[PDB]
Amino acid sequence: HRYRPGTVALREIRRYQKSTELLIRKLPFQRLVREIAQDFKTDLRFQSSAVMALQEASEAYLVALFEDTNLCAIHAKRVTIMPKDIQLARRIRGER
Amino acid sequence: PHRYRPGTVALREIRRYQKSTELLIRKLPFQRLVREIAQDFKTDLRFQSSAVMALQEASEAYLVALFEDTNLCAIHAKRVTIMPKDIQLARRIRGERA
Amino acid sequence: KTRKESYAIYVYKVLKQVHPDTGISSKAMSIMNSFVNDVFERIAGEASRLAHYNKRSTITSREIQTAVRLLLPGELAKHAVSEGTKAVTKYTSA
Amino acid sequence: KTRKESYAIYVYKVLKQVHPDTGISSKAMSIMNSFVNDVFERIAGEASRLAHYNKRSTITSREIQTAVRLLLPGELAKHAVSEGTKAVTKYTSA
Amino acid sequence: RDNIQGITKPAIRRLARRGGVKRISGLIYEETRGVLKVFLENVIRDAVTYTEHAKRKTVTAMDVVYALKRQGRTLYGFG
Amino acid sequence: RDNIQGITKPAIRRLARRGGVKRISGLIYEETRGVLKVFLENVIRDAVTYTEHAKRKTVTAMDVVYALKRQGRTLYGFGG
Amino acid sequence: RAKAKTRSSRAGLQFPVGRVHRLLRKGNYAERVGAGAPVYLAAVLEYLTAEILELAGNAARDNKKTRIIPRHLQLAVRNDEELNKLLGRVTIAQGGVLPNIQSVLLPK
Amino acid sequence: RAKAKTRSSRAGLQFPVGRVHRLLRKGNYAERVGAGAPVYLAAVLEYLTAEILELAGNAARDNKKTRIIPRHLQLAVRNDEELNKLLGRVTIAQGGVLPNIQSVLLP
């Protein structure tokens, strides 16, 4: 038994559009945030709420960017998203 | 007789209108359109000349920026022609018609 | 401990007015508190700008009405305006 | 009549400092006046927000410096800070 | 009054040429007219609200400037 | 100190699934990591500026909220 | 001295007129604040709160729940055109996204 | 009394410190305004004005013109990365656009 390609993908799309949880592991994200903040000030402390807020903002930003990327990919008569779609979405949004 | 291939005069016009700074819409038709639009909100409205000039400048800047984004959208789909779906996609991604 | 003011009891009173048998969690109350603060700041800033434009030094109910007209979109604004007027008149009668 | 203040003579003084042989039209001067007013408003508003966040009643040079660092992008900000600092030194000595 | 047709096809072509467009489909003129009408409606509504608050009957350039600025479209050159 | 790889490929794939994406190219992951790093750098720089102005050493949640609101990304639920 | 009655009770509101007046006075908005501005602001804020809370409670009821969570607030806001326009650039924590899939990707 | 000396000359600036102080005091920003805030703000505004005018005058000179017109201000702002990012959502009247044609369109 084996599902055709694109079936489990649609099932995952339906599954992760119903939940509200965070899709990035918390410890790697906290380490990344601390490493990034190391370049501005040395020996910095973070409230847990600060890291949680950063994670929520980052995940929302990435999800919206992927929606715009999907629209750009569909425009070119395609189903896969390529880096050129991300670049076009960011350039039109004004970020680049 | 002489004749230019399609796209030569188009590129000449692109070079000519990206070097000037004038306004590309006739002033009287735009003023009439602005007055007709403002008729709905309030009756017997008077406009300064500067108000209409500012509206025209803002509208032209908005349209030129939108056409730049539309050209990018058209080139993305391996095209040279500019279609309404490109305008719609640019306005969706910008956040206007979303 | 220093007192921390919030729009919690008032939001709960309104919720009991609308849905008498429905409760609310803590994250949802935080979100509603942030929403109330955001809308208050937006309307008050627009009203202050309106007062400054016309060289006035008083924020009146006309400035608040025009700020609500400018900020709130479409039908929302209309209803909001009505509610606001409905209050002030009553406040004047008493 | 009435009096209408603007940043025209100061912009002309700076222009004479930078390009002593170059003039400026009227539309360009209007644009420069609008630019100065816009930047003043941005920096002052950000400084007011910073003072309000920390529960301070005073706008100081620290608030202005933080507002400049938050608003102005890249190396621009750095250079601006230097200029500002130097002024507040030369003013304090004299 | 059908003055939206006063924004002619050659005017839209000029605005597209300034934007770098080389070839133009024949269906974008109605779309551009609709886009322009929506933009103008928003800005003029805000400007007329600003005018009515001041108890005036003339729409000044400052009203248009404020209406544009409150939409994140700051315009330099008109005060 | 290469913690940017802590944002694994399955996590990016989940974020794309929530956005409605069905098929993902193989080079999307490095681009997504770069985009996320840019966003985080901007927000954290603003938050650290806000923290330093207050003469504090911990980055509170309110600093993050103000830093986000500066960029036009208001966030509800954390702080007031 | 008569028995003190709150200003929000005279206006028939639930949101505090006195606190809103203090916030307007202390917030550095204008030199003077009229007597009717706090009442108008309190009425508008109470209206908006009641609207969004009604929508969120309906969304919770449709889910066979009793308590409102951020998911219900997000569902209420994103399913309403005016509220979505008012909160276009706002992120709600633990809200998720609105379920939609492009028609191109579905099997045919 | 001694002869009056403007604060701008005392701080070595061209922009007005007294006018900036008055605008800060009457602009409804805070209850009090420090003594050195107007000096800092005036210095920053003068720096930004000098930058813009330097670039605009260079653009005018490269065009064989003496006076600065809005086209030169637009050319100065748009060709500079930091200034373009600062004035990213700003329209300059009678400024035009930057000459730029996509390479795919060229023959």
Curated annotation (Swiss-Prot), chain A:
Alphabetized GO MF terms: DNA binding; protein heterodimerization activity; structural constituent of chromatin
Modified residues (N6-acetyllysine): 18, 41, 77, 84
Main location: nucleus
PTM annotation: Acetylation is generally linked to gene activation. Acetylation at Lys-84 (H3K122ac) by EP300/p300 plays a central role in chromatin structure: localizes at the surface of the histone octamer and stimulates transcription, possibly by promoting nucleosome instability.
Positions carrying N6-(2-hydroxyisobutyryl)lysine: 18, 26, 41, 84
Cleaved signal peptide residues: none
Superkingdom of the organism of origin: Eukaryota
Magnesium listed as a keyword: no
Role description: Core component of nucleosome. Nucleosomes wrap and compact DNA into chromatin, limiting DNA accessibility to the cellular machineries which require DNA as a template. Histones thereby play a central role in transcription regulation, DNA repair, DNA replication and chromosomal stability. DNA accessibility is regulated via a complex set of post-translational modifications of histones, also called histone code, and nucleosome remodeling.
Protein name per Swiss-Prot or TrEMBL: Histone H3.2
Residue numbers of the full-length protein present here: 40 to 135 of 136
UniProtKB/Swiss-Prot annotation, chain B:
Residue positions where Phosphoserine is found in the record: 20, 49
N6,N6,N6-trimethyllysine PTM sites in chain numbering: 19, 42
Modified residues (N6-lactoyllysine): 19, 42
Modified positions (Phosphothreonine) in chain numbering: 43, 70
Lipidation (S-palmitoyl cysteine): 73
Origin superkingdom: Eukaryota
Function, as annotated: Core component of nucleosome. Nucleosomes wrap and compact DNA into chromatin, limiting DNA accessibility to the cellular machineries which require DNA as a template. Histones thereby play a central role in transcription regulation, DNA repair, DNA replication and chromosomal stability. DNA accessibility is regulated via a complex set of post-translational modifications of histones, also called histone code, and nucleosome remodeling.
Family as reported in the entry's similarity comment: Belongs to the histone H3 family.
Record-given protein name: Histone H3.2
Stretch of the intact protein here: 39 to 136 of 136
From Swiss-Prot, chain E:
One example GO MF annotation: structural constituent of chromatin
In-chain residues carrying the UniProt-annotated modification N6-lactoyllysine: 9, 55, 69
Keyword Acetylation: yes
Record PTM N6-butyryllysine, positions in chain: 9, 22, 55, 57, 69
Residues recorded with modification N6-acetyllysine: 9, 37, 57, 69
Modification sites for N6-propionyllysine: 9, 22, 55, 57, 69
Residues with the N6-glutaryllysine modification: 9, 37, 55, 57, 69
Modified residues (N6-succinyllysine): 9, 55, 69
Compartment(s) of residence: Nucleus; Chromosome
Modified residues (N6-(2-hydroxyisobutyryl)lysine): 9, 22, 37, 55, 57, 69
Example of a GO cellular component annotation carried by this entry: nucleosome
Residue list for modification Phosphotyrosine: 29, 66
Glycyl lysine isopeptide (Lys-Gly) (interchain with G-Cter in UFM1) crosslink site(s): 9
Post-translational modification comment from the UniProt entry: Demethylation is performed by JMJD6.
Keywords: Acetylation, Chromosome, Citrullination, DNA-binding, Hydroxylation, Isopeptide bond, Methylation, Nucleosome core, Nucleus, Phosphoprotein, Ubl conjugation
Covalent cross-link site, Glycyl lysine isopeptide (Lys-Gly) (interchain with G-Cter in ubiquitin): 69
Any one Gene Ontology BP term: nucleosome assembly
Residues found modified as Phosphoserine: 25
This protein's record includes keyword Membrane: no
Function summary: Core component of nucleosome. Nucleosomes wrap and compact DNA into chromatin, limiting DNA accessibility to the cellular machineries which require DNA as a template. Histones thereby play a central role in transcription regulation, DNA repair, DNA replication and chromosomal stability. DNA accessibility is regulated via a complex set of post-translational modifications of histones, also called histone code, and nucleosome remodeling.
Subunit structure: The nucleosome is a histone octamer containing two molecules each of H2A, H2B, H3 and H4 assembled in one H3-H4 heterotetramer and two H2A-H2B heterodimers. The octamer wraps approximately 147 bp of DNA.
Similarity remark: Belongs to the histone H4 family.
UniProt protein name: Histone H4
Whole sequence portion shown: 24 to 102 of 103
UniProtKB/Swiss-Prot annotation, chain G:
One record GO biological process: heterochromatin formation
GO terms for MF: DNA binding; protein heterodimerization activity; structural constituent of chromatin
Residues modified as N6-glutaryllysine: 85, 108
Modification sites for N6-succinyllysine: 85
Domain of life: Eukaryota
Chain positions found as N5-methylglutamine: 94
A Gene Ontology term for the protein's cellular component: nucleus
Residues found modified as N6-(2-hydroxyisobutyryl)lysine: 26, 64-65, 85, 108
Subcellular locations according to the entry: Nucleus; Chromosome
The protein's name in its UniProt record: Histone H2A type 1
